[PDB]
Design a protein around this ligand. Structure first.
Ligand SMILES: Nc1nc2c(ncn2[C@@H]2O[C@H](COP(=O)(O)OP(=O)(O)CP(=O)(O)O)[C@@H](O)[C@H]2O)c(=O)[nH]1
Ligand SMILES: Nc1nc2c(ncn2[C@@H]2O[C@H](COP(=O)(O)OP(=O)(O)CP(=O)(O)O)[C@@H](O)[C@H]2O)c(=O)[nH]1
Ligand SMILES: [Mg+2]
Ligand SMILES: [Mg+2]
Lengths: 168, 172, 166, 179
């Protein structure tokens, strides 16, 4: 039968492989057979991290269902939510923000001190930015280089979208 | 005192689910149909009392998703549901009992009793008596029903409140 | 029961939606129920195009299996192979290049006259570039702006990888 | 030169050596460093069978995980033959070959309707021998379960990979004179 604790030399379990392929029935099976959901690969990446970078919302939710943790940090200090913010997958960003009614933290800084809202401002993903703001994302909280999320905004458009909220 | 309620919105495709939510939360309507992809989410905050704040997590569930294996995941620990159909399409009404089966067989309250469900007859601004709806609801375990239009903002507020009321009772 | 010909106002069938979600059992079902595999959305995009842009290799193969065409062009003249070359998904690029045991054509130009190898050189994806060259990708064929794939190479490193072959 | 093109499956359990066998055969390289294959990988081998004949091998590298995932009907379709691989240093991976063999045969036939030629590979033969299986027993095994043949191989040291490839190409060229 399946050995769900099997590793390769980058620390990829089968459950990591299932995540990055989107194969959700595989996930069901692997979890059912023992697989460690918050297994970390050689650079600190959870299968949830892989789902949130590929943008598979289906898998992201299925993992969170099977009690994956969203607060795990990779070598770069990134949660899965950071990774979904850097690659703009708002469908995944939402799954994370809403899965748990004690909702995702949002103040967690990576190695560069960037919260998810910084990252979202940087690459200019508006829908993401909004979703985050709607759920309480701080606009002051200050990255390592002493920047706020406003500071990080791409253009005057995105900037003003954020300022909208700040004032409220 | 703050509550937070996961509310499912479910029903067949094009039935109006996304537009109901978008109206309720951002007072907007489009005529343009963009199919929802998997599950969308929205947050409504409201001031029930001086004493009470409630917060609604609105889970917008693509009408396609009932032919996939993912509903057990979306529904889990839901505090209640809007089941939606399109008055302008009888086929979508026959569907509500599919969705209702799915729902009840996969989410219960803490008590073990089914979760409060409110039936929405949407698109009521276009072209089943009230006494029949009541019999229907009474037979199939809907708390209640409403003719709604996201286009014109009929009855969406009132449906929300009716359901919040039910769920606040259940928090006893 | 399911209506697999249903359209939204961007011309997305359920099979388009399944593709972009990676939900492969959905695809199986939809195809089984009638769904048009080479259905094109409002901007000319096949569900295979959506799979090859999201990079879902699983789905891209399952579509090819259910007889999707790889030579369909979107509003920008891109095949799914172009889209997989622009976003670097070599797992998908490979599926396309190897599915069919004849070829699959690598000379197809998009609106800008870019073949897949141009696009791969541009964004510098080495594994892609190689896979294409190994399966015959021409190095001369000239985009609209009169550029070759070599011309389009990101750096001297990639350039030389391509010159190796030619 | 007539040109042939053969889809060849490479299948078997995880870490068993499939990718490295292919990488050796095609690029003469070996790494000790295990990178799990994700879904299906591909490689192309060209060879000069003689004066008159060129053959071209599409090598379908199939993650050992993929046998628990119902995508195998897709990968296998219209395959012209297969390497089934196990790790001489792990008896568990040998028990597995009959799983993979079942899967294969129940889902791909030749044009004739007969099963496709399958060659069993006992890989990592440069280490120490675990399956309790003499050469005369391998032959009985192959004979019983419809393998064309078997080979002890090492991608590490380039044992027997060439000879296995040829043995299989030979089988499949025979089958091209049956349709
Ligand atoms: N007249 C009228 N039209 C409506 C109303 N609500 C929605 N529509 C129209 O019906 C169409 C479908 O609405 P939509 O909210 O996308 O439906 P949906 O249930 O989310 C369909 P899916 O589940 O695939 O995402 C839209 O084009 C919308 O403009 C309404 O109350 N009245
Ligand atoms: N000594 C020795 N080691 C080998 C041989 N072939 C492979 N290995 C080693 O075994 C490990 C796994 O090899 P790999 O080819 O990646 O196995 P695989 O079947 O492709 C594993 P998967 O199917 O899960 O991708 C690697 O560390 C590799 O170096 C061999 O012939 N001899
Ligand atoms: Mg919708
Ligand atoms: Mg491998």
């Amino acid at each position: 039968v399946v050995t769900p604790f099997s590793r390769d030399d980058r620390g990829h379990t089968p459950l990591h492989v299932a995540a990055v392929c989107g194969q959700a029935s595989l996930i069901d099976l692997l979890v059912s057979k023992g697989a460690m959901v918050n297994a970390t690969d050689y650079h600190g990446a959870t299968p949830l991290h892989l789902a949130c970078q590929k943008g598979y919302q289906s898998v992201t939710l299925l993992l969170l269902h099977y009690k994956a943790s969203a607060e795990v940090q990779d070598n770069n200090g990134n949660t899965p939510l950071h990774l979904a913010c850097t690659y703009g997958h708002e469908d995944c960003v939402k799954a994370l923000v809403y899965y748990d009614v004690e909702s995702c933290r949002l103040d967690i800084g990576n190695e560069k001190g960037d919260t998810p809202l910084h990252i979202a401002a940087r690459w200019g993903y508006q829908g993401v930015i909004e979703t985050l703001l709607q759920n309480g994302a701080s606009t002051e909280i200050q990255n390592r280089l002493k920047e706020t999320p406003l500071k990080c905004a791409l253009n005057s458009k995105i900037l003003s979208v954020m300022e909208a909220y700040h004032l409220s | 005192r703050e509550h937070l309620f996961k509310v499912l919105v479910i029903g067949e495709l094009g039935v109006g689910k996304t537009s109901i939510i978008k109206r309720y939360v951002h007072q907007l309507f489009s005529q343009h149909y963009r199919a929802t992809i998997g599950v969308d989410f929205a947050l409504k905050v409201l001031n029930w009392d001086s004493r009470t704040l409630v917060r609604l997590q609105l889970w917008d569930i693509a009408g396609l998703e009932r032919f996939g294996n993912m509903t057990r995941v979306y529904y889990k620990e839901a505090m209640g549901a809007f089941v939606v159909f399109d008055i302008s399409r009888s086929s979508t009404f026959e569907a509500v009992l599919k969705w209702k089966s799915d729902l009840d067989s996969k989410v219960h309250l803490p008590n073990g009793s089914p979760i409060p469900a409110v039936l929405l007859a949407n698109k009521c601004d276009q072209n089943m008596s009230p006494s029949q709806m009541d019999q229907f609801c009474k037979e199939h375990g809907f708390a209640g029903w409403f003719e709604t239009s996201a286009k014109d903002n009929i009855n969406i507020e009132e449906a929300a409140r009716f359901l919040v009321e039910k769920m606040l009772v259940n928090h006893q």
